[PDB]
Amino acid sequence: PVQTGLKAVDALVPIGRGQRELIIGDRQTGKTAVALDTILNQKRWNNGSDESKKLYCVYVAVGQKRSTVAQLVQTLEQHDAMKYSIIVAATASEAAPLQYLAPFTAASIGEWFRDNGKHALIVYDDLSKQAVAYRQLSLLLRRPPGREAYPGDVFYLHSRLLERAAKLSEKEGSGSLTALPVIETQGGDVSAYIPTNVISITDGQIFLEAELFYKGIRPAINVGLSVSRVGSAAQVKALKQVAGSLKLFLAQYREVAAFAQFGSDLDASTKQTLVRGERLTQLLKQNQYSPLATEEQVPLIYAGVNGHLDGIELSRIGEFESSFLSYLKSNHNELLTEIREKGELSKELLASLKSATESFVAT
Amino acid sequence: RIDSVSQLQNVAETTKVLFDVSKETVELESEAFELKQKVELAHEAKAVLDSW
Amino acid sequence: AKSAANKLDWAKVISSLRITGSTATQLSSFKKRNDEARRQLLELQSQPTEVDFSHYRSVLKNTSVIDKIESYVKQYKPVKIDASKQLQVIESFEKHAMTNAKETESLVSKELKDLQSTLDNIQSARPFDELTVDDLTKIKPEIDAKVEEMVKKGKWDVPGYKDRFGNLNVM
Numbered sequence: 001p002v003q004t005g006l007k008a009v010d011a012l013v014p015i016g017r018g019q020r021e022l023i024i025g026d027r028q029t030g031k032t033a034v035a036l037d038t039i040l041n042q043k044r045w046n047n048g049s050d051e052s053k054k055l056y057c058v059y060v061a062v063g064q065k066r067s068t069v070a071q072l073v074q075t076l077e078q079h080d081a082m083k084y085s086i087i088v089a090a091t092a093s094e095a096a097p098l099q100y101l102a103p104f105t106a107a108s109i110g111e112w113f114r115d116n117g118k119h120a121l122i123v124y125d126d127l128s129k130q131a132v133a134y135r136q137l138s139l140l141l142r143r144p145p146g147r148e149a150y151p152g153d154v155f156y157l158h159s160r161l162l163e164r165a166a167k168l169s170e171k172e173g174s175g176s177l178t179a180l181p182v183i184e185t186q187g188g189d190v191s192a193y194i195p196t197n198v199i200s201i202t203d204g205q206i207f208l209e210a211e212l213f214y215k216g217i218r219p220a221i222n223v224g225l226s227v228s229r230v231g232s233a234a235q236v237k238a239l240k241q242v243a244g245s246l247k248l249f250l251a252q253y254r255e256v257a258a259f260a261q262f263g264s265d266l267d268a269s270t271k272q273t274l275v276r277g278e279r280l281t282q283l284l285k286q287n288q289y290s291p292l293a294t295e296e297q298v299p300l301i302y303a304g305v306n307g308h309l310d311g312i313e314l315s316r317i318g319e320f321e322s323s324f325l326s327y328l329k330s331n332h333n334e335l336l337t338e339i340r341e342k343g344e345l346s347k348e349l350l351a352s353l354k355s356a357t358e359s360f361v362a363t
Numbered sequence: 364r365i366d367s368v369s370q371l372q373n374v375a376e377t378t379k380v381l382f383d384v385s386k387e388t389v390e391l392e393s394e395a396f397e398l399k400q401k402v403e404l405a406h407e408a409k410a411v412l413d414s415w
Numbered sequence: 416a417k418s419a420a421n422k423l424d425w426a427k428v429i430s431s432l433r434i435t436g437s438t439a440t441q442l443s444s445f446k447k448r449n450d451e452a453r454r455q456l457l458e459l460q461s462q463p464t465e466v467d468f469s470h471y472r473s474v475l476k477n478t479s480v481i482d483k484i485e486s487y488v489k490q491y492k493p494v495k496i497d498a499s500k501q502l503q504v505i506e507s508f509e510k511h512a513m514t515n516a517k518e519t520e521s522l523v524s525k526e527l528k529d530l531q532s533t534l535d536n537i538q539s540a541r542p543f544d545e546l547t548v549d550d551l552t553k554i555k556p557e558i559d560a561k562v563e564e565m566v567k568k569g570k571w572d573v574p575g576y577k578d579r580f581g582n583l584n585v586m
């Protein structure tokens with residue numbers, strides 16, 4: 001697992017070491033914050049001692065402003081990520097073949113950590129400006145454009161970039177490199193020529209739709225679109241035990257999304273699923289710079305799945321999160337250590353967790 | 364009335380333990396208050412020496 | 416070992432189900448939740464409360480103050496002590512509590528067996544189709560008192576009677 005620390009990411013769309021996942025979205029819709037929260041979540045192991053659990057972060061800003069990269073370095077030194085960060089900056093003041101080159105050189109930086117046994121995460125941000133720089137370099141050398149004037153080999157560019165990232169087996173030293181490219185689309189589109197080439201390389205999408213961030217639900221993962229292909233074989237075992245309904249349950253809630261807009265009175269089952277779906281939608285919100293480790297992602301999702309939230313009003317859920325977390329931090333600390341060590345819920349762990357839920361649920 | 368009698372059967376025996384252990388868990392954390400003093404002075408020292 | 420305290424608190428929560436309208440008792444548990452959730456983040460949040468004289472003093476090449484504020488920390492290294500001052504007042508509060516508790520505990524233990532005795536007396540002493548009203552006068556002089564006052568005032572109407580017991584007359 002690559003524990004991103006977000007609730008909804010590790011709930012629904014898990015990331016494996018060596019699984020190229022795409023963060024696609026729109027302009028000013030919360031794209032960079034997912035990668036930044038993942039880099040800040042890797043502080044759980046970068047302070048630690050085992051190498052094979054550390055996870056080095058290489059953030060590769062292309063096409064962005066100088067001052068944005070300045071604030072991002074300042075952010076990664078507030079929360080102390082700069083003992084393991086590598087910033088490759090190719091800011092938009094500088095000219096085009098620098099931007100054509102800089103993610104590739106950062107992929108060489110990633111391959112150095114890959115061949116030498118260690119594990120490392122890289123974040124391309126954002127390759128829709130790399131293809132801007134590449135169409136600039138191929139429309140100044142008379143090479144004729146293709147569909148929407150990206151030149152005809154622009155599939156090959158993101159190919160030869162993202163294919164230098166996978167999981168090496170034991171024969172080469174069990175190192176890895178995992179990539180999160182970021183694609184800026186145009187108005188919720190998933191069918192221009194560029195975002196239908198990054199999708200046809202990476203192993204899945206986290207489609208950060210603008211409409212949900214317009215309702216403030218940040219991060220705004222559209223659940224029914226965001227999927228991962230080899231995520232499921234590499235999730236933490238505990239979340240895979242207590243969220244095997246959660247994807248199907250949000251699919252169920254998405255089925256009755258447009259059916260309840262009629263305002264018609266319905267049966268009991270759709271009202272039950274509607275209340276639990278609204279509690280889960282309000283539940284997966286998260287403030288900036290607070291990634292929750294998997295040892296705390298399991299009980300919150302566990303309280304979400306098994307109907308315990310249904311007596312609470314909808315506005316209290318945001319403080320229910322921090323209240324139930326501090327309730328488990330003060331009293332049932334041994335359960336959090338069990339989830340930390342074992343990474344798996346046995347039957348006794350499950351019953352103790354159900355008791356510890358129903359305790360705090362009762363008030 | 365037998366039921367409303369039988370609910371309060373062993374309750375005083377338990378709330379003479381509730382009382383003590385609850386007030387102990389309340390008032391054994393001014394320890395942590397005087398720990399906080401030692402915390403925040405070292406935080407101020409770390410802040411100014413980072414400025415240095 | 417705090418889980419015994421919190422387990423007995425939730426035991427008193429499912430026992431404070433029996434008294435709806437708790438004013439500040441759950442608010443007292445809220446205050447212990449407040450500072451107990453505060454103290455754990457306070458102890459996990461801090462660094463080792465010291466200036467790292469090995470690495471972090473050798474950083475500043477033009478040092479001149481790190482030994483000064485090092486000595487200032489070691490001056491205030493006996494920082495400030497707490498207070499378990501309560502050994503006079505807290506014994507008074509638990510004294511009043513244990514007094515009321517033992518009174519209530521012995522009282523309900525008496526009253527349970529008194530109602531069990533009343534149930535046992537009720538089972539074997541209901542001669543309901545053959546009881547004499549003279550025995551009711553003998554068990555209650557309230558009977559004869561109300562009857563005599565009722566004749567002396569003259570309220571021959573018995574109120575509250577016609578509903579469950581019929582008037583039974585011809586008209």
Ligand SMILES: Nc1ncnc2c1ncn2[C@@H]1O[C@H](COP(=O)(O)OP(=O)(O)OP(=O)(O)O)[C@@H](O)[C@H]1O
Binds near residue numbers: 029030033219286
């Ligand atoms: N969890 C959160 N808490 C608070 N603010 C958030 C959160 N997530 C996103 N935001 C807001 O989203 C805004 C933009 O964040 P972000 O940079 O990820 O968007 P973006 O589309 O990546 O922008 P750009 O593409 O220019 O980098 C920020 O101002 C931030 O305040």
